[PDB]
Symmetry: D2
Subunit: 726 residues, 4 copies
């Protein structure tokens, strides 16, 4: 038998910290985590243990190692149906990846409201706090292929499928509150410009190329989302630590028929946190699956991703009360003007069993609404409603994609639609049309109503000529980018400048760089000059003279637009690298591990080889990874306990570990003779804010380090990192 005697092949079916066990299909890892959607998938889950290997026709296979041949050195025979079924299935495994958002990672969970919303919406899923709705959520990047890296600079997708009692609602959002373009007719142009260029299909997962910046320079409506992408919002630490937005204004409709405009928000209960660029880019090379891994291992540990759903609500009479058009998806609604009302909480608590069957095949579409919601005339939303139904026809093979298990509603569905490729449902209705007498008109229409009623559009007044024309109210491009800029902390503004500077340096045609700097000068001169200086460009007098755009309804900043201005840090689910030596001070390691456990912070024990080392008191410590195998890129903070520090003092890899973490603004803590490493990061004898140092690891050394971790990164260190060659 091939499994090891000791049973160490099999992960424990209990939550465990990252790296402690091999990861596993969600139903094997967490068999008692259930919701109505996960339970309904039971009819299609297939096991394996104790079953005979068969063909797809149920024929048991005797020899799965050899083709059938004429003699054991002879030709393969065409009658080998076993070989050919197995190779045919393999030959046809792939399906088209998504046209955008092809790279994505997904989990099961549930949603529950905090109170009934029946005064604003008759949506059944929001009617009662004890109504639990299963969800399936997929997070994604935008530009790269399904095989591209996770920690690129990109917008991120945040798509949620609610399996409600009155239908599937998909909330298909992103991690920034606006889009790049105004009208869906432009989407193939913008997407072509950002995707790999058509001659040579370079670059992957990057906007750092001429075509993108050509389009941006000629389409200033893109400048607002460009500012977000260039900020640290473009490189989140985790899907758990980014915001989500629906972007468009939609409508809530109550049982009285009153419409309220809404924009949707997701607020991360782990707080907001992003990488820095150098770290992000390096992480695409050292772990291109970092975000997929982080999400799966968080759920396996019980560090469930949690988000609060939020609504910005604007009465119908206030449609024209702002400086910008509510229908314009390049404009955000500042939370200073319209606060976010917190409406419920979503928890993602179970990984899929099979990536392909549940994540790759999942189909989300913003036109999947339910009674109690309605659309608006936002012209980007309007065109999206067409695109998602259409693309699913080729990507998923035909018009029965709703019968793919992950996409099936959990509520009833009955109608007169029939056939299509890979039809699963076998209809018994004598009628396949209505009106019909032969089945007494079943299934029947249902009038709209306050609950379980049929869908009826809000009777919005339409008045105008049939025109292909952009609303003049959408023609203002610079005041939102300026508001976002002025709402950033000084360090966030510096990262924006550096984002633009690094990227535009990779544009080959210099006039495109100059055209973009000209657009920046319409937003903010300080920004425009700081980017220009890095590109060797000089602003003209005309450019130094452009009048700033106006404030937004009297606002010259909104701190809700910054990642870091208002503290919201949570250390639960973060990870620290502990750099070991061959006789660790065991009292340091006890203290550290204890303090980390108390806050839900994981640790990884690192050394120069695998296996184990022995602590001063004889404790055997198991090594998780090498210095070079689990780089500082992958952790939040680094601790070096006392002991035989000469063992690692001259280890290039250990030195570099600390140089890299320092450069990336991560908290570092040094105990006892570990303080010899201060030399490598150039720290004055008297200490520096963000380096924790003491004679040993006592309770106070840990409180200080965990305080640095709650603030995420040590922004005050930025002017000091220039001198470190890392």
């Amino acid at each position: 038998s091939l499994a090891p005697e000791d049973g160490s092949h099999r992960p424990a079916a209990e939550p465990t910290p990252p790296g402690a066990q091999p990861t596993a299909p969600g139903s094997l890892k967490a068999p008692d985590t259930r919701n109505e959607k996960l339970n309904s998938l039971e009819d299609v889950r297939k096991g394996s243990e104790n079953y005979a290997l068969t063909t797809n026709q149920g024929v048991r296979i005797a020899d799965d190692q050899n083709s059938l041949r004429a003699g054991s050195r002879g030709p393969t025979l065409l009658e080998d149906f076993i070989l050919r079924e197995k190779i045919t299935h393999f030959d046809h495994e792939r399906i088209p990846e998504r046209i955008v958002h092809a790279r994505g990672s997904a989990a099961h969970g549930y949603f529950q409201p905090y109170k009934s919303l029946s005064d604003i919406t008759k949506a059944d899923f929001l009617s009662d706090p004890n109504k639990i709705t299963p969800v399936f959520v997929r997070f994604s990047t935008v530009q790269g292929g399904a095989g591209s890296a996770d920690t690129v600079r990109d917008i991120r997708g945040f798509a949620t499928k609610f399996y409600t009692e009155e239908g599937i609602f998909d909330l298909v959002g992103n991690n920034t509150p606006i889009f790049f373009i105004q009208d869906a007719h432009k989407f193939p142009d913008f997407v072509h410009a950002v995707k790999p260029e058509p001659h040579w299909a370079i670059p992957q997962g990057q906007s750092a190329h001429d075509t993108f910046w050509d389009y941006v320079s000629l389409q200033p409506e893109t400048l607002h989302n460009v500012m977000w992408a260039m900020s640290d919002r473009g490189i989140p630490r985790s899907y758990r630590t980014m915001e989500g937005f629906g972007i468009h204004t939609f409508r809530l409709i109550n049982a009285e028929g009153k419409a309220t405009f809404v924009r949707f928000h997701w607020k991360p209960l782990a707080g907001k946190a992003s990488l820095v660029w150098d770290e992000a880019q390096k992480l695409t090379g050292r772990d291109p699956d970092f975000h997929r891994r982080e999400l799966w291992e968080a759920i396996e540990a019980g560090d469930f991703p949690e988000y609060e759903l939020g609504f910005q609500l604007i009465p119908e009479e206030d449609e024209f009360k702002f400086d910008f058009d509510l229908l314009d998806p390049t404009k955000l609604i500042p939370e200073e003007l319209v606060p976010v009302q917190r409406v419920g909480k979503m928890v993602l608590n179970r990984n899929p069993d099979n990536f392909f069957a549940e994540n790759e095949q999942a189909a989300f579409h913003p036109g999947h609404i339910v009674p109690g919601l309605d659309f608006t005339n936002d012209p980007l939303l309007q065109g999206r409603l067409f695109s998602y139904t259409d693309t699913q026809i080729s990507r998923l093979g035909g018009p029965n994609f709703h019968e793919i298990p992950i996409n099936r509603p959990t509520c009833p569905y009955h109608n007169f639609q029939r056939d299509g490729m890979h039809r699963m449902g076998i209809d018994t209705n004598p009628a396949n049309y209505e009106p019909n007498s032969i089945n007494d008109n079943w299934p029947r229409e249902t009038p709209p109503g306050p609950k379980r009623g049929g869908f009826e559009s809000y009777q919005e007044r339409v008045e105008g000529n049939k025109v292909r024309e952009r609303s003049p109210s959408f023609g203002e491009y610079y005041s939102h980018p300026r508001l976002f800029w002025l709402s950033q902390t000084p360090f966030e503004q510096r990262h924006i400048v550096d984002g633009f500077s690094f990227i535009l340096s990779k544009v080959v045609r210099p006039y495109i760089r100059e055209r973009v700097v000209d657009q920046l000068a319409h937003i903010d001169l300080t920004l425009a000059q700081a980017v220009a200086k890095n590109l060797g460009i000089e602003l003209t007098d005309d450019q130094l003279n452009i009048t700033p755009p106006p404030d937004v309804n009297g606002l010259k900043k909104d701190p809700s637009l910054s990642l870091y201005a208002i503290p919201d840090g949570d250390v639960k689910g973060r990870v620290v690298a502990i750099l070991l030596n061959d006789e660790v001070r065991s009292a340091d390691l006890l203290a550290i591990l204890k303090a980390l456990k108390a806050k839900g912070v994981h640790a990884k024990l690192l050394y120069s080889r695998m296996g184990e080392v022995t602590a001063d008191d004889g404790t055997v410590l198991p090594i998780a990874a090498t210095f070079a195998g689990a780089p500082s890129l992958t952790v939040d903070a680094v601790i070096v306990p006392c002991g035989n520090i000469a063992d690692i003092a001259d280890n290039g890899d250990a030195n570099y570990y600390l140089m890299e973490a320092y450069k990336h603004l991560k908290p570092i803590a040094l105990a006892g003779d570990a303080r010899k490493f201060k030399a490598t990061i150039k720290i004055a004898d008297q200490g520096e804010e963000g380096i924790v140092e003491a004679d040993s690891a006592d309770g106070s050394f840990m409180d200080e380090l965990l305080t640095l971790m709650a603030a995420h990164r040590v922004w005050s260190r930025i002017p000091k990192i220039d001198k470190i060659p890392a």
Copy 2:
């Protein structure tokens, strides 16, 4: 509520004769008819009564009569996701039809062996007479599309899927015991020659065109199956009244590893019966769905199609004992040489619920065998094994077609195949490869053995060089055609001559007709002369002198090759037209209807209009159809009861009804004054064989009519019909 208040819209859920009630889905017509496969389809059967109409996402629809528009006379809006989901699904309802056998009709049933065959085969489904195997059978024509007519002249397909406990076994046969060609490499040539011609796509459902006979004239191997297609075997009365054959020699393998050669047969328990050509061709116009309809209505009546499986068995030591090669699919094995041993019984006892989902998506493939069976080197079989797997990947949309509910095994299936379009099964196995340790190598290979073993091929010796070469043993083309011809009755030989004569008359290029006639002269000079005379062709002295091919192992005829030489008539399930008048003798009608009921023979009451007529004694007679609506083509015999004959005596439709029935050799019975119709069909005063006549329908009138019905048709009338203008 649109249903009539009397509930007449819904058919009774109990057996009823053809036409008595509207037809229905099999689970609503016969809910208590169950088998293991029909029970396993419960998970995908969808009802309808009492359910709300929804989108495929489960959203209730309020108004399924209107698109969303800006104003009730305004333009339709892109945001109507309900209109677009409904039209998108409709727009994608069609899938490719089968490349051959596109037109076919199917039903569910079950099979049981009469005794255990474990001495000759370890096949589980043949191991125990109390083992019931569910089946799904599809009957088909070969050339025409899925919308072509049923009663064309063509070979028929007879495909049976056995859902066994050790795997699906598909026995994919035809209604003749040989095929047209020897090696699969020719199959696209042959099928292209018989299909509609490629410039204009004509003719549908017919071999009566130049390309077919061009290929035949140049490929004498085809002549044997051509003889059968030109005979009345090419125009079966019903799928219930044709034979089936697997054509190829296969092997049975027993638990001791002994191989026995086998050819598969199905014998129709209802007997063998065919139409005549003019009737068949007329019926393609008046009811192009006649065989589909007859199959479905026989099942709803309780007249279940029954067939007996039988095997012709030949020991391995006797492979070379015949004048023909066992591996040559253009050669039959005469039952006089190798008798068919009865093996078991198949009953088809339930119709599908949804034709598309179950019939159209069904996939049969002769490579689907189970342990206990194996292949031989028949070069036509060997190529089929490649084709069915391949075609199904495009027809059914991908490699997961075994997950379509009709195709699923009822036994366990587990393996390491993953993904593909339309993937339903969600695999939870940690491993997707073997050998593996992480799942202790499950699912595991199973050694071969007497029961529940893995499949291993019979270790047949192969010896020879890699060649593209036809075996010289296959190089004989005329002896089997001659054996078939000499085995037919004189009236069957007349119909074969008429078959060739009518069909070659449609070949436009006369030299092709002359080439076919020359091939006939190598089969039998009497056949060749009779066909030449009809075509205005004179055989040359050379042709008159071709020597006949040899007898087949000493045989000069085998009566098992004729439809009619050995009586096997069965009247149950047949149908008689009764031509009413406005004052029917009610005592005639009582005697006629009860005698037919007692033998399971159906009746259809016909008149010149719909509604009712009233018999001499006041009995109200409900009319099934008019004389034009339900022509004689659709019944087996015609009865005219006494009454007011002058009512119908001058009705051109009634007279022509009898003229057509008479021409087509059907029994006709005339009571009382109905004898006045003797002048219409030119019957002598003292009467003639095949016309039943009496003063009333009492005494022996119905027994005499039923005796004629058991003989099927009045062959003795053939020389009398040439004169009547019908």
Copy 3:
């Protein structure tokens, strides 16, 4: 050589009456008949005479009569790439038929206006009586599949693709001047009710069944087109002898921007003529390809279908 000595295997490349010669591909039957669209298809026309038989990769085949096997009575070998290519292509011949109007018959031709219509429309194809526009036209039935019969009782389609200098215009019409239903939302209902019923897939090519009349009886907007279908309009003699209509009101827009409402009509220059029902129905059995054949043969004879 397999052809007969006298050359009678090959139809004359001149106009001939129906039945005088075997029918043939248009470019072989009428090589001097050309238009801009027929010429443009030259890049993809493939001949055959004097060429070697090859795989799709251009490899010449020596023996197209046999699979590769180990001995001449032995098993077929997986390395036979010639057999597998030929059988792969055959196995993948079919594509889905059209959801409606799956049975149809088509020909090439040309159009030209009698006079410029520039007062009412700027459409370039209507701008000059001497500017000829190629067309491709398909006629069809509605309900039956691609292999159903021609002379059923049904509405007929009349679809014309005009290959204009300013883009393709498709006029996709039928042979009666109205449709059965008012709103496209109901089309899948109406089509389902007319098509073969879902349990047993019967009847083909026929509205003579319960579901269709159930729908009609509950949707009186259907009655107009039902009248046309029940008249001898439902059974035309030929596609040359029926009317065509676009059904919907469309607009014409001239250079000054003026809109005029328009309905489109085709008038058959051969006249209007239909079968009688007993004839139509028997002809579905004796020649289910009657209209397809009659159209192709009229064109081979020089009796070109003409419409106004």
Copy 4:
């Protein structure tokens, strides 16, 4: 067949031979080539059997497999020489 959408992938321009190709195969999704041969089968007489098979030869001949000797039983077995 599934990656490139059907059996006519040799007609996608990059995959096309530059040398002649002619046979009796027809149809399939995405069919570009418009065949004018009156026959779509062989042997035929109606187009004098063209396009025709070609015997093997030193240049420009038909493909024939090398006539390697095959001898053994039908087995699913690795050759011991591979172990």
